[PDB]
Design an enzyme around this catalytic site. Structure first.
Site, PDB file in Angstrom:
ATOM      1  CD  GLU A 286       1.724 -72.543 125.049  1.00  0.00           C
ATOM      2  OE1 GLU A 286       1.887 -72.489 126.288  1.00  0.00           O
ATOM      3  OE2 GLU A 286       0.644 -72.231 124.507  1.00  0.00           O
TER       4      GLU A 286
ATOM      5  CG  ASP B 284       0.637 -74.167 129.788  1.00  0.00           C
ATOM      6  OD1 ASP B 284       0.000 -74.068 128.716  1.00  0.00           O
ATOM      7  OD2 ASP B 284       0.517 -73.351 130.731  1.00  0.00           O
TER       8      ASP B 284
ATOM      9  CG  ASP C 173      -3.856 -72.573 123.806  1.00  0.00           C
ATOM     10  OD1 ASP C 173      -4.761 -72.521 124.667  1.00  0.00           O
ATOM     11  OD2 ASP C 173      -2.681 -72.939 124.069  1.00  0.00           O
TER      12      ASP C 173
END
Ligand SMILES: [Ca+2]
Ligand SMILES: [Ca+2]
Ligand SMILES: [Ca+2]
Length: 404
Positions: A205, A180, A291
């Site tokens: 990410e 993340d 997201d």
């Protein structure tokens, strides 16, 4: 063969009876679809319900998703079907449980008895003025406004996170990582963690903004946007490293291409526009995630054309990642499962050869490994370019597949 699956959304933590326990029942469906790896939410105690503001990293039982028993159990059922488990690793930042003489929350608690992860302000990037005491190193990456950024240059941090990570694998059964907010720290810092725990994979990410124009659409050329993702992989270790990256370039492009602009799906050199075209083996493609899609919808895929989205990624080079909602909540279960079948049925993999055949504003046709041909667009006819010996296969709204 390798096909990922995101096993949650922004609303999962609210599941009655526990999200993991509910997932237990979706293991067979997911495995029978062809999925090879399942990405699961941050398993640790978090100030935020969704798990993204981790506090006591060892305290798995304080997780809104479920406790250690339910998680280990979910993982085991995944391993029983030959499907691996990917943990959502959030280490760019972390929250403190106790305050110190300054009254600032900056004394952390790992969640065990001993002092593990019981850091203090010396472990917060000094430039994160809000929590540090100025003794630490400068943040090696971007800062996270709502929480303390960990100084990954500190020896004990690197050693203690590597420990925590190994434990997730050994005690819980996690196979790989999903990093993340990886722009939060340097690729050289991620390398330390990836190398120190040797996971089946580690998709990061790394999400930077795309180059857009005055009207607000992405520009046709997205080479700098994809060069940055490729450079991350290079700095992380390239081919020697298990590191990989989400193809936000492809996600961004495709998001606008299916809007009657499929000429966007091919670049000057004739290759795939996103990271797929330059380094498919390192690209994890996707339509949406928690997201971009879900109830957060920061960059949702044109709702009305999600299948063309899967038509694309499920049949093309690069590693496809199916989103939980599309496979169960929207009703493309069978359509999607089929496309994967077709993908497997031909041994199509991340590195498969891609030969585009048409980039019309309303129609995209491309041949993969010469065994599969797909088509997305409002154009009702493109047989003209379909090679000889191919028979219509899967098909649905504005898309169709072919095999020979
Ligand atoms: Ca402790
Ligand atoms: Ca911060
Ligand atoms: Ca940071």
């Amino acid at each position: 063969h390798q096909v990922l699956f995101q096993g949650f959304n922004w609303e999962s933590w609210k599941q009655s009876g526990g999200w993991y326990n509910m997932m237990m029942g979706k293991v067979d469906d997911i495995a029978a679809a062809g999925v090879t790896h399942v990405w699961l939410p941050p398993p640790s105690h978090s100030v935020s319900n969704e798990g993204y503001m981790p506090g006591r990293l060892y305290d798995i039982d304080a997780s809104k998703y479920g406790n250690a028993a339910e998680l280990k159990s979910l993982i085991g059922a995944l391993h029983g079907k030959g499907v691996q488990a990917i943990a959502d690793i959030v280490i760019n930042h972390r929250c403190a449980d106790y305050k110190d003489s300054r009254g600032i929350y900056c004394i952390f608690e790992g969640g065990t008895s001993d002092g593990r992860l019981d850091w203090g302000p010396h472990m917060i990037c000094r430039d994160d003025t809000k929590y540090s005491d100025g003794t630490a190193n400068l943040d090696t990456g971007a800062d996270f406004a709502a929480a303390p950024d960990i100084d990954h240059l500190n020896d004990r941090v690197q050693r203690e996170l590597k420990e925590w990570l190994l434990w997730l694998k050994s005690d819980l059964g996690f196979d790989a990582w999903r990093l993340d907010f990886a722009r939060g720290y340097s690729p050289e810092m991620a390398k330390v963690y990836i190398d120190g725990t040797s996971p089946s994979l580690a998709v990061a990410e790394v999400w930077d903004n795309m180059a857009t124009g005055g009207d607000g659409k992405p520009n046709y050329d997205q080479d700098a946007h994809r060069q940055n993702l490729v450079n991350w992989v290079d700095k992380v270790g390239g081919a020697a490293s298990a590191g990989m990256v989400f193809d936000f370039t492809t996600k961004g492009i495709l998001n606008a291409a299916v809007e009657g602009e499929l000429w966007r799906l091919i670049d000057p050199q004739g290759k795939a526009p996103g990271v797929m075209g330059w380094w498919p083996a390192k690209a994890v493609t996707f339509v949406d995630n928690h997201d971009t899609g879900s109830t957060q919808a920061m960059w949702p895929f044109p709702s009305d054309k999600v299948m063309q989205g899967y038509a694309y990624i499920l049949t093309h080079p690069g590693i496809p990642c199916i989103f939980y909602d599309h496979f169960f909540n929207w009703g493309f279960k069978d359509q999607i499962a089929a496309l994967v079948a077709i993908r497997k049925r031909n041994g199509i993999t991340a590195t498969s050869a891609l030969k585009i055949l048409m980039h019309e504003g309303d129609a995209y046709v491309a041949e993969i490994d010469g065994k599969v041909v797909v088509k997305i667009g409002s154009r009702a006819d493109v047989g003209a370019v379909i090679p000889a010996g191919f028979v219509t296969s899967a098909h649905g709204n504005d898309y169709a597949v072919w095999e020979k």
